[PDB]
C-alpha cells in the first residue's frame, strides 16, 4: 500500500521536525534519529520502485506488511512522547528524553533489519543466510524459509532445544532478542542474538550470565550514554561496561576506564564476549563492571550450575531491558492509566485484575475511579 508508505512519511516527517528543534540539541552520534528516518524512508521508496507492477507480491509479503505496521506505531509513539513529555524533552537527563534515546536505538535496529531483508530493495528474506551454522540449522528446521515468526511460535520452538525456565525468563529474553519491539522475531534478529550470545551450545546460559545476571551489562544504551555513565568512575580505572554495538549490529561494545583516567570503548571483532571479558579481567583492564568492586567469574562458560532468581529477572526487566511494557506482565504494552493514582499498565493485566482480584489498583491498592487510554509513558 503506497497509502501505507505515504501515511508513514507524514508521521516520520513530523518526528524529524520535532527532533530538529534547537532546544533539543541532538548530537550527530550514532544512533542519530535525524539520519535514521529519512534513510528508512529512502530505502522504502527503493523497495517501492522494485515492485512497480509487481506490487501484489509486496502486498502479500508478510514481513514488509508487519514492518510498516511497526514503523507507524513507533513514529506515532515518538510523536506523543513529545506531546506528553513537553518541556521535559529538552532536559538532557530526563526520563522522557531517555525514552527518546531508546527509540533512536529501535529505529536503528529496525533499519538494519529492513536493509538485511530487502537489500537493494529486493526481498531476499526467504534466502537469508544465518551466520552460525548451529543457529542456522535450528531456524530452517523449525521455520523453513520464514522471515519472521510470532514470538510465541519462536519461544516454543526454542524451548525444545534450550530450556526456558519460566514466563519471566521468557519475558527477560524476549526483551533482549526482540529488537524491533513488536512481538515477532525475524530471522535477522535471531541472527544477531545468536551471534551476540555464541556459542549456540550454551546459548541461554551465556545470555543469562552475560546479559541478565551481569551488572556490567547495559540494556538499550548508546556510545554517548556509556561515555556519560563512566564519568563518576573516571577516578576508578578498571571500571567498565558493555552493551550491544549500534553501528556493528551483532557485536559487543565494551566501554572502560583506563589508569590514564580517560574513557575508551572497543569492539572485539571475532573473539567471544566472555573470553574477551575473561582475558580483559586477567590483563587488568575490566575490573569493576558499573564501578562495583566485585567482578564475576565467568570461566566455565568455557565448559557447574547456578541459578537466576525470579527476583533477578524482574530486576533486568525493571532496569530498562523492556521498552514501554507493563511492569506487571512485562509482556504487553502500557496502554492504560489508572485515576486517581496515575499508575500505568496494560489493559490485559487491568482487566484480569478488576474481574478476579477486585476494584483496587495493583501497585498501590487505591480504588480505581476512572481510566485514561495512553500511547506512551515518558517516564517508563
Amino acid at each position: 500500500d503506497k497509502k501505507m508508505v505515504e501515511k508513514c512519511w507524514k508521521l516520520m516527517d513530523k518526528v524529524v521536525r520535532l527532533c530538529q528543534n534547537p532546544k533539543l540539541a541532538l548530537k550527530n552520534s550514532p544512533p542519530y534519529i535525524l539520519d535514521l528516518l529519512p534513510d528508512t524512508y529512502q530505502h522504502l521508496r527503493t523497495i517501492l520502485s522494485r515492485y512497480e507492477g509487481k506490487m501484489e507480491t509486496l502486498g502479500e509479503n508478510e514481513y514488509f506488511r508487519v514492518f510498516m505496521e511497526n514503523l507507524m506505531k513507533k513514529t506515532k509513539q515518538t510523536i506523543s512522547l513529545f506531546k506528553e513529555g513537553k518541556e521535559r524533552m529538552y532536559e538532557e537527563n530526563s526520563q522522557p528524553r531517555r525514552n527518546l534515546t531508546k527509540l533512536s536505538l529501535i529505529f536503528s535496529h529496525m533499519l538494519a533489519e529492513l536493509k538485511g531483508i530487502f537489500p537493494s530493495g529486493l526481498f531476499q528474506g526467504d534466502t537469508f543466510r544465518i551466520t552460525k551454522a548451529d543457529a542456522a540449522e535450528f531456524w530452517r528446521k523449525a521455520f523453513g524459509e520464514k522471515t519472521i515468526v510470532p514470538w510465541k511460535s519462536f519461544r516454543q520452538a526454542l524451548h525444545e532445544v534450550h530450556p526456558i525456565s519460566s514466563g519471566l525468563e521468557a519475558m527477560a529474553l524476549k526483551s533482549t532478542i526482540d529488537l524491533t519491539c513488536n512481538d515477532y522475531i525475524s530471522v535477522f534478529e535471531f541472527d544477531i542474538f545468536t551471534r551476540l550470545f555464541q556459542p549456540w551450545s550454551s546459548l541461554l546460559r551465556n545470555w543469562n550470565s552475560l546479559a541478565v545476571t551481569h551488572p556490567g551489562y547495559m540494556a538499550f544504551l548508546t556510545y554517548d550514554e556509556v561515555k556519560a555513565r563512566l564519568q563518576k568512575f573516571i577516578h576508578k580505572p578498571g571500571s567498565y561496561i558493555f552493551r550491544l554495538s549500534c553501528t556493528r549490529l551483532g557485536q559487543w561494545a565494551i566501554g572502560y576506564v583506563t589508569a590514564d583516567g580517560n574513557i575508551l570503548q572497543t569492539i572485539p571483532h571475532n573473539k567471544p564476549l566472555f573470553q574477551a571479558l575473561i582475558d580483559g579481567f586477567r590483563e587488568g583492564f575490566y575490573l569493576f563492571p558499573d564501578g562495583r568492586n566485585q567482578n564475576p567469574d565467568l570461566t566455565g562458560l568455557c565448559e557447574d550450575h547456578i541459578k537466576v532468581t525470579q527476583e533477578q529477572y524482574e530486576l533486568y526487566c525493571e532496569m530498562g531491558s523492556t521498552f514501554q511494557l507493563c511492569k506487571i506482565c512485562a509482556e504487553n504494552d502500557k496502554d492504560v492509566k489508572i485515576e486517581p493514582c496515575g499508575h500505568l499498565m496494560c489493559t490485559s493485566c487491568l482487566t484480569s485484575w478488576q474481574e478476579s482480584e477486585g476494584q483496587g489498583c495493583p501497585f498501590c491498592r487505591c480504588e480505581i475511579k476512572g481510566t485514561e487510554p495512553i500511547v506512551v509513558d515518558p517516564f517508563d
Binding site: 556510545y223 554495538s245 553501528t247 575508551l264 570503548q265 580483559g280 583492564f285
Partner: peptide, 9 residues
C-alpha cells in the same frame, strides 16, 4: 574519544 579503539593490550 568518539570512536571505537582496538581492544586494549
Amino acid at each position: 574519544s568518539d570512536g571505537y579503539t582496538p581492544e586494549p593490550a
